[PDB]
Design a protein around this ligand. Structure first.
Ligand SMILES: Cc1cc(CCCOc2c(C)cc(-c3noc(C(F)(F)F)n3)cc2C)on1
Ligand SMILES: Cc1cc(CCCOc2c(C)cc(-c3noc(C(F)(F)F)n3)cc2C)on1
Lengths: 178, 285, 252, 29, 178, 252, 285, 29, 29
């Protein structure tokens, strides 16, 4: 997918098994799927971060496609959840798709220390965001049997970065000439 | 009490982040978590709206994230070489067409804004390598030649008199030279990007090269020919002071190729050209 | 109702019964040049209702393989009535715009367009050394550029939508004034942008201030593909003013 | 020349050269 | 002409074709025919310029010679005008020769940026000054059939120069000795 | 001095050091349409300095046999900058003018031109029954019409200067706004005319409001005939305003 | 509020240029564009009188165009050479008859006025070239010998005692020497030009050499003979402070030939001697 | 010795040597 | 900027940089 706009969309569809997993990523602001986002890029110019993160999701199926999804945040000190039941025991939002296409899940600042390192460093690893099917993806006849979802990220009022440093998300391996 | 203003400067508590207030369970038909990204606006929901929060007194401050702080650090923008190999008259002087495009580190930070207006602090770090064993008494001259002024073509060109241009003479063993420059553009802000040309034909130039002419930096070893050859490398550092920036933009994702242009190279397997790391699948953290 | 809009400019009125609000770029509404920011001393000409009106560009067809489209302003309006005449008879021009992108389908169609207005969108060329995009490529006129079609001339700009045709990632385009046309929610996008530049007025012929970029982030799908789903763009200058009159510039 | 202020904890905020470009980093907010 | 006082005069005479061109120069203060004027020489010690310029012309024919001339300023973004019609669409003065021998044309500051570079640099190239015959050069019998015109230049109240630099209108190629 | 004049309009300034005052037609100075006399409800466009400036027409040569010249307004200004563009993109237009006729010779030349501005100069055809002057004949453009030269097509208007090309006597043209350029006295004529019509605005393409007629009543004589004595006309619209914008009308 | 005066100095807004006011169409018999250059006065017409202008608020300032600014920059006025080749006693000292006529760059600026009165700031840039490999410990003495005082004829002449003359001793490795000099003329201003002689006969001298005697600058390497030979080049820079200038004049158009004289060389094709570039014809921009 | 001035933003305009020729560039106007 | 105090034996207790980390050893008690 890298090199395509499809690297930005998650596909949903009618499931045959219940409570299936949709996606799972680390919540660390400068960790991998989210390092290249704007907040991830700026966070990469600083050594420490703190505050709550806001993840939003916009459903892009037809106006006749329905779906209920569970978005969960698993605080640290445990592995990523292996089932919807395990995931829903953490912080979560049950999203019902309807007239308003977008939902937001806030990953609260739940940490031992007041700040965490922006770079991938275990001790200050913030947990995971996983998405599961709450019910199913239902559609009437003659309607596309698959649909995309876009995912966004930004910082809440308490977001803050500290200790400026150079980034490792960009480099120079030769002279930049005229 | 400005003095109060001064105390905040010393402790770096000028811009405080807000507190998290206590929230409670709710059951209503106002659903803040729901919205429409189509509007082009970010949902304004805060933690108190989704979970039940406790009261926490935020101490964090945003001073270090200010545009002044982000762009206010000296970074290398050029490495000048005067390498005496076999002809002192030809090798003891050189010139550089000034720009902030040759070093990726600082170029990328400035390019996170479309326009930026600032004063500059230039610091120079000269180092004399004794190729044959002695450096003698090295005295350097760095002269700023604004566009239009005569450029020296020999180590004794009359232009080195510097009757009106600004020159900084540095003597080996003294502190690193440094000076300030005021905002130099003929416009109100420097263009970090420019979607324009200098004409309306297929041969017109495109980009910041049309607007960012800063002149030339001419330098020479003032000392006359010495028996032992030296290689003098002068690194120029730049720092922005009293900064303002407008219209933020996406950071450069691929390597830079050339100055004044957004041109890039792309290989056969594109994931190697960007910092994005391939995920095994959607569910592998 | 929060999902209806009527925009009246000059003798034109545009409506939409499924909008997602409107965006006012950088929060500033277009306004005329003030004497404190002005620099060119001659009195400006302000065509008013004859130039500040909606001009509808050529329609484009959105299909399951479309990669995007882009237009540059004021270039796209160069052959449009009085506004177009004024930009060629004068050295300087200044103007804001109301951009209204239109695209309707049905409740059984799905797809998403990211509609963005970028200030100073300096295009890149790929794998061509220091050769930059040529003038005629970045001045397509009202026909704009359909990403993924052109016959590789040398000064042809990048056609990589995921890298914003300029070496930066698509997902970050949201930092610029933008909206989405998500077929299940809305059928139009409205962006109102002020004049943005480091000088108070500029050459309308050598400099393009804004670029309208429309990229389909979610593929158009339906079970009635033979029905063509076009995308139409209508742009209205706002507070257009010109200065330094002379003969008409003839380009290329 | 500089801006002496009083409360007693004076903040002699000196500017040693005659050009605005010469002073250090700007105050925030 | 260089090396003669005639390098300072433009010759006028009875024309056989209408609306002929008399002269054409760039308006840039430090550009070529006007680099050696006093304002051009001073402008050459600075990098930037701004403000309006004042061009004056003094007719030197007999008191019985008449003439009407069109002096025009063409703002940038277009080529120099090829005809009187093309030229008169820009800023202009129709000069009628009579008891007062001199006329002045003001080239207003019409620029994108607040200043321009004094040195020949396209982007900040200010346009042209051209002169054409509005009617003709008429004389009674027994009167010289040609006459000269002198051209002057100075700066208006808004003229201003900035960023001192060394000049390229003078050089030293050897020692100046006793 | 009562014999000097400087007329500034837009970015143009015209001077003359031998005038015979100025004439303000019917004693009314040009002014914009007021809401009490207006009728077309849409808001007018007023180009201001970009259209209200001097436009110099093609010069004419006056010789011992010249019979006259005429131009019709606004027709003569149809290919003149912004004013010309505005008259074709709009259904209606309204404007006054400053007409400055220039002609210099010497103190040893003699001759007299009667310069007249006629409202509604409906031309006649001679000995052709009820066939009237054809559209292209009365719409010569900036080149006007040189009396006594044309190749007799049928719808060609009268070329009889003594009968004002309309069946009335030349000596009575003085009842219209006029001046004389008597070579021994002055070398220019200046007439400033208001908008005159029975409707507040009108089609700039089908209707010519004023006609500039220049007839040499006293033959040009001198003892240096090889020196050509041209006549140049410079016209500046005043208070030009247009209404009812649309696509550009293409004529003939 | 002088303090207000100080703020203007810091921002360089002491001398403001006037605003352009709005003007309107006019029809009158007052014709400002018309005048008579014969009077020797420049027509005083402004843009508002010829075109219809808008109101523009001018921010430009003329501080940098002041005579203080124009002549207040250090330019080289001399390059002194002490080259040890084969006789330390003869080559370790030298002398220079002071003047501001040898370097074209600054000479030309000063010569744009007929008279000028100013104080001087002299800065010296010495550089020791190690011709054989070592510079040892170089100590220099620069002595100002006003007209009449004894000029040294050997490196140990009693005149180097400097009992009353001013001497500056510089030691290699310390900052560049610098000192100020007050306005030195016996008249009220320095003559940049002088149409006079020192007598009334065919052999009298003509020009500024009659009036601008400034004395001699005698210098020597204080250090005694060292094994390794060095070549010490001292460049003298001058800057005018607290300046006043009278009667402006045309700038020098051809190269300078000699000091204190307006004499020039002219070749066979004169257009090569002046900065005027040949035009193809009157209508070729 | 130097000219302290007040408004509070003092402008200590110092002249470090006892000769007028020693001071820096002059004030304009 | 610093805290001038009076009794007359002033104690100009200067802090030359704009960061708290830059000052010397702390006062006791
Ligand atoms: C965009 C943008 C913003 C800027 C300002 C860059 C500052 O650039 C310089 C640099 C880096 C060095 C010199 C310089 N180096 O040495 C000298 C002197 F000491 F010789 F004056 N001047 C002058 C300028 C204008 O350039 N492009
Ligand atoms: C006209 C005109 C104006 C001036 C003043 C020129 C200042 O000239 C000098 C210079 C350049 C150097 C010295 C000098 N160099 O070194 C020394 C000292 F350090 F030895 F005192 N004095 C003295 C004068 C008067 O000279 N001619």
């Amino acid at each position: 997918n890298i090199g395509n706009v499809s690297m930005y969309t998650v596909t949903l569809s009618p499931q045959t098994k219940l409570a299936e997993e949709i996606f799972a990523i680390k919540v660390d602001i400068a960790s991998h799927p989210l390092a290249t986002t704007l907040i991830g890029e700026i966070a990469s110019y600083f050594t420490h971060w703190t505050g709550s993160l806001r993840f939003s999701f916009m459903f892009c199926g037809t106006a006749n496609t329905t779906l209920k999804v569970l978005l969960a945040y698993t605080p640290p000190g445990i592995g990523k959840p292996r089932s919807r039941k395990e995931a829903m025991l953490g912080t979560h939002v049950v999203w019902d798709v309807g007239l308003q296409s977008t939902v937001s899940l806030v990953v609260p600042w739940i940490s031992a220390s007041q700040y965490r390192f922006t770079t991938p460093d275990t001790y200050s690893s913030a947990g995971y965001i996983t998405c599961w099917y709450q019910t199913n993806f239902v559609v009437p006849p003659n309607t596309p049997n698959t649909a995309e979802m876009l995912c966004f990220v930004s910082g809440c009022k308490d977001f803050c970065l500290r200790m400026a440093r150079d980034t490792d998300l960009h480099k120079q391996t030769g002279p930049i000439t005229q | 009490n400005p003095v109060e203003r001064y105390v905040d400067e010393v402790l770096n508590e000028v811009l405080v982040v807000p507190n998290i207030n206590q929230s409670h369970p709710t059951t209503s038909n106002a659903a803040p978590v729901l919205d429409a990204a189509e509007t082009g606006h970010t949902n304004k929901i805060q933690p108190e709206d989704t979970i039940e929060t406790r009261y926490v007194q935020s101490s964090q401050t945003l001073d270090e994230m200010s545009v002044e702080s982000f762009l206010g650090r000296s970074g290398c923008i050029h490495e000048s070489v005067l390498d005496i190999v076999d002809n002192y008259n030809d090798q003891s002087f050189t010139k550089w067409n000034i720009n902030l495009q040759e070093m990726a580190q600082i170029r990328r930070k400035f390019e996170m804004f479309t326009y930026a207006r600032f004063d500059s602090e230039i610091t120079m770090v000269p180092s004399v390598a004794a190729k044959d064993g002695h450096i003698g008494h090295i005295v350097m001259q760095y002269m700023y030649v604004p566009p239009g002024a005569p450029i020296p073509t020999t180590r004794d060109d009359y232009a080195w008199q510097s009757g009106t241009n600004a020159s900084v003479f540095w003597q080996h063993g003294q502190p690193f030279p440094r000076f300030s420059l005021p905002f130099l553009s003929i416009a109100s802000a420097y263009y970090m990007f420019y979607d324009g040309y200098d004409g309306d034909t297929y041969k017109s130039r495109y980009g910041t090269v049309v607007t960012n002419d800063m002149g030339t930096l001419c330098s020479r070893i003032v000392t006359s020919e010495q028996l032992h050859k030296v290689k003098v490398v002068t690194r120029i550092y730049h720092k922005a002071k009293h900064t303002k920036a407008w219209c933020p933009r996406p950071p450069r994702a691929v390597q830079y190729s050339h100055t004044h242009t957004t041109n890039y190279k792309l290989s056969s397997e594109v994931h190697n050209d960007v910092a994005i790391r391939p995920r095994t699948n959607l569910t592998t953290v | 109702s929060d999902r209806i809009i009527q925009i009246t400019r000059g003798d034109s009125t545009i409506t939409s019964q499924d909008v997602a609000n409107a965006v006012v770029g950088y929060g500033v509404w277009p306004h005329y040049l003030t004497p404190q920011d002005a620099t060119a001393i001659d009195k400006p000409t302000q065509p008013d209702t004859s130039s500040n009106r909606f001009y509808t560009l050529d329609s484009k067809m959105w299909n399951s393989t479309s990669k995007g489209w882009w237009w540059k302003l004021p270039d796209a309006l160069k052959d449009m009535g009085i506004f177009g005449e004024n930009m060629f008879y004068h050295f300087l021009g200044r103007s804001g715009y109301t951009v209204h992108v239109q695209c309707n389908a049905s409740k059984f169609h799905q797809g998403t367009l990211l509609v963005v207005m970028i200030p100073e969108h300096q295009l890149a060329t790929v794998n061509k050394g220091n050769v930059n995009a040529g003038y005629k490529y970045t001045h397509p006129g009202e026909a704009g550029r359909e990403v993924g079609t052109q016959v590789e001339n040398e000064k042809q700009p990048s056609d990589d939508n995921w890298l914003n045709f300029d070496g930066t990632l698509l997902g970050n385009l949201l930092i610029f004034p933008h909206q989405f046309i998500n077929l299940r929610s809305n059928n139009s996008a409205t962006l109102i942008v002020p004049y943005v530049n480091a000088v108070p007025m500029d050459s309308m012929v050598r400099h393009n201030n804004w670029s309208l970029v429309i990229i389909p982030v979610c593929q158009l799908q339906s079970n009635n593909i033979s029905n063509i789903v076009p995308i139409t763009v209508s742009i209205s200058p706002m507070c257009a003013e010109f200065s330094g009159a002379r003969a008409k510039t003839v380009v290329q | 020349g500089a801006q002496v202020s009083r409360q007693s904890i004076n903040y002699f905020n000196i500017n040693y050269f005659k050009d605005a470009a010469s002073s250090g980093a700007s105050r925030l907010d």
